[PDB]
From Swiss-Prot, chain B:
It comes from Oryctolagus cuniculus (Rabbit). Mono-ADP-ribosylation at Glu-4 by PARP16 inhibits polysome assembly and mRNA loading, thereby inhibiting protein translation. There is a cross-link at residues 2, 27, 35 (Glycyl lysine isopeptide (Lys-Gly) (interchain with G-Cter in SUMO2)). Coiled coil: none annotated. The gene is RPL24. This is Large ribosomal subunit protein eL24. The modification N6-acetyllysine is found at residue 27. The lineage of its organism: Eukaryota, Metazoa, Chordata, Craniata, Vertebrata. The chain holds residues 1 to 63 of 157 of the full protein. It is found in: Cytoplasm. The modification ADP-ribosyl glutamic acid is found at residue 4.
From Swiss-Prot, chain C:
Component of the large ribosomal subunit. Component of the large ribosomal subunit. The ribosome is a large ribonucleoprotein complex responsible for the synthesis of proteins in the cell. Keywords: Cytoplasm, Phosphoprotein, Ribonucleoprotein, Ribosomal protein. Its main location: cytoplasm. The modification Phosphotyrosine is found at residue 29. Signal peptide: none annotated. NCBIfam families: PRK08571.1 (NF006344). This is Large ribosomal subunit protein uL14. The keyword Cell cycle does not apply.
From Swiss-Prot, chain D:
GO terms for molecular function: RNA binding; structural constituent of ribosome. Keywords: Citrullination, Cytoplasm, Isopeptide bond, Phosphoprotein, Ribonucleoprotein, Ribosomal protein, Ubl conjugation. The modification Citrulline is found at residues 4, 15. Citrullinated by PADI4. It is found in: Cytoplasm. The chain holds residues 2 to 61 of 196 of the full protein. GO terms for cellular component: cytosolic large ribosomal subunit. The lineage of its organism: Eukaryota, Metazoa, Chordata, Craniata, Vertebrata. Component of the large ribosomal subunit. Signal peptide: none annotated. The modification Phosphoserine is found at residue 12. This is Large ribosomal subunit protein eL19.
From Swiss-Prot, chain E:
Component of the large ribosomal subunit. Interacts with DHX33. Disulfide bonds: none annotated. Component of the large ribosomal subunit. The ribosome is a large ribonucleoprotein complex responsible for the synthesis of proteins in the cell. Belongs to the universal ribosomal protein uL3 family. It comes from the Eukaryota. It is not required for incorporation of RPL3 into ribosomes. The modification N6-acetyllysine is found at residues 20, 27. There is a cross-link at residues 20, 40, 47 (Glycyl lysine isopeptide (Lys-Gly) (interchain with G-Cter in SUMO2)). The lineage of its organism: Eukaryota, Metazoa, Chordata, Craniata, Vertebrata. This is Large ribosomal subunit protein uL3. It is found in: Nucleus, Nucleolus; Cytoplasm.
Length: 107, 63, 131, 60, 49, 49
RNA sequence: CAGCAGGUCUCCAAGGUGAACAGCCUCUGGCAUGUUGGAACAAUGUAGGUAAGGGAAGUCGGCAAGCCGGAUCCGUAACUU
RNA sequence: UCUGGGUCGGGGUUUCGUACGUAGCAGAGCAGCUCCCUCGCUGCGAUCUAUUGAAAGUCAGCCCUCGACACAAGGGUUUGU
């Protein structure tokens, strides 16, 4: 109920339409963090390295239109952080993008 | 109310839209928008353009 | 009887328009438009069908170096007819005329706009094709 | 911690730029105490530091 | 909307209005069809079937 | 929104007599009202209170 | 007067495109964008661009901007020492 | 609580113009084998046709969704005749 993980797809073109060429990719990582705090209630969001590679795989200017991403709220069992829960966000390689919904996967 | 067929593309041009073009020797051509207008002014044959009706009358497509 | 029904006008003072008649002239240098009251720094422009003051630059020398009245019969700027059609004639053309509306010439090369015909019925007499 | 010293020495021993010097990020704590060459040349034999390959510039 | 304060007595204001055509083409770009049925008949069959 | 009207203009004395035009209009969706009260006003020397 | 877009004498010079040690991209080598970042994209600005029709009618003045531009085959006037 | 809004997906509309792959006896021709057959076979080969009005985008400030996902009376500061 609190350590649940599930699939999501994020349309970048919705969240970057308007910004300049040199700030498209940095804004996208900020929008993934903003998107992760809405569904998952944890304000602390960690973006895994392969997801950062996937957004930057086509340059800072030509950010990919659609991306399929996995959000996983975790336990935070080691750090005595003021936040008891965090979300680990990782990238899922997907070939075809049409007709995929936010399915709830089982860990 | 006279709907009339575009000279380059071949789509029906409703009376409120389109553009009228008449060259010097005396004949008149009809364009639905500037997309079709820009092609005819640069000597582009519609028969080599895929999306026009005359392509479909030449390649026997559709129907 | 016949009104104007204002159109899009795009031929200001200084434009050279070709001669579409048989007076021997080639071009017409627009010097001023007859009927324009004016405005500060606003160049007097003419559409099709307006009596305009022109001057031949190249052509027959007995027509050059003097002032001739003219009526514009073709224009490049797309103007809107009242039924909602946008027309342009791929060139700017005019004819040499006097103050009464009588042509110096006798024949017209190229079409003449429909609104130019009814304000100037004598221009429509020698027009080979209309609109 | 501070591996600026280790990268400068790793460039001189390997005769490379230090662009091709790759320090091990996961097991880092036994790299910082090697504050000289031949303390890191042992780490070359230990596989902690590997010369990165040249970026490919294809002539084909 | 509000009724006019002035007393409208002109041939422009008192002209009877009879419509003849309604232009219901798409305003989301340069449309060319009034309705879907007029479009689909001219569009013919599509790949999405 | 806005759209065209093709209509017949029958004004006398014009050049557009017995010919058609296109005409820009504005579409205003006008839902019916619900009356939920009345108010009264009295004229005063200081205004209309 | 400074970690100042200023000034200061020299050695070596990869690959591609391309006449070229010209301009652009990449390798070796070097760096974090040059006394800071985040949020919006108001006016007026600085630096770039585009404009239907006319083409200097603007202005003291074609100022600025704009046109042509490389190579190959023709062809090339007045004048002249 | 007219249960609502958000996200995705689905269509509608539209922008551009026919995607990769496959197949072809199209394809200027060229090369190999040789049953020296060269309409014989196999390869390279700009491009062409069928799939293919195809592929891609489509609100960030376009329209319906009740198709999936979770969320939604939750927090803080003040206000008295």
């Amino acid at each position: 109920n609190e350590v649940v993980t599930r699939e999501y797809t994020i349309n970048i073109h919705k969240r970057i339409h308007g910004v300049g060429f040199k700030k498209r990719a940095p804004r996208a990582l900020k929008e993934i963090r903003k998107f992760a705090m809405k569904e998952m209630g944890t304000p602390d969001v960690r973006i895994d390295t392969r997801l950062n590679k996937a957004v930057w795989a086509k340059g800072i200017r030509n950010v990919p239109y659609r991306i399929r991403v996995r959000l996983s709220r975790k336990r935070n069992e080691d750090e005595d952080s003021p936040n008891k829960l965090y979300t680990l966000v990782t990238y899922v390689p997907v070939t075809t993008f049409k007709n995929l919904q936010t399915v709830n996967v089982d860990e | 109310m006279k709907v009339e067929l575009c000279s380059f593309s071949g789509y029906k041009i409703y009376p409120g839209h389109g553009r009228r073009y008449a060259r010097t020797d005396g004949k008149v051509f009809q364009f639905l928008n500037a997309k079709c207008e820009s092609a005819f002014l640069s000597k582009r044959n519609p028969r080599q353009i895929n999306w026009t009706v005359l392509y479909r009358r030449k390649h026997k497509k559709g129907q | 009887s016949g009104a104007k029904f204002r159109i899009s006008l795009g031929l200001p003072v200084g434009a050279v328009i070709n001669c579409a008649d048989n007076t021997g002239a080639k071009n017409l240098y627009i010097i001023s438009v007859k009927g324009i009251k004016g405005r500060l720094n606003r160049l007097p422009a003419a559409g099709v069908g307006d009596m305009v003051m022109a001057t031949v630059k190249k052509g027959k020398p007995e027509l050059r170096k003097k002032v001739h009245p003219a009526v514009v019969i073709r224009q490049r700027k797309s103007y809107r007819r009242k039924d909602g059609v946008f027309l342009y004639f791929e060139d700017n053309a005019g004819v040499i005329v006097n103050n009464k509306g009588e042509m110096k010439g006798s024949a017209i090369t190229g079409p003449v706009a429909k609104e130019c015909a009814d304000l100037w019925p004598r221009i429509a007499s020698n027009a080979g094709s209309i609109a | 911690s501070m591996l600026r010293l280790q990268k400068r020495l790793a460039s001189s021993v390997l005769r490379c730029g230090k662009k091709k010097v790759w320090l091990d990020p996961n097991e880092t704590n036994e790299i910082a105490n090697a504050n000289s060459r031949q303390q890191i040349r042992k780490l070359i034999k230990d596989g902690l530091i590997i010369r990165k390959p040249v970026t490919v510039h294809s002539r084909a | 909307l509000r009724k006019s304060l002035l007393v409208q007595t002109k041939r422009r204001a008192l002209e009877k209005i009879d419509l003849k055509f309604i232009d219901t083409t798409s305003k989301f770009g340069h449309g060319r069809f009034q309705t879907v049925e007029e479009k689909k008949a001219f569009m013919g069959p599509l790949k999405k079937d | 929104g806005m759209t065209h009207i093709v209509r017949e203009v029958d004004r006398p004395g014009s050049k557009v007599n017995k010919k058609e035009v296109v005409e820009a209009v504005t579409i205003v969706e006008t839902p019916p009202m619900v009356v939920v009260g009345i108010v009264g006003y009295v004229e005063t020397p200081r205004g209309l209170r």
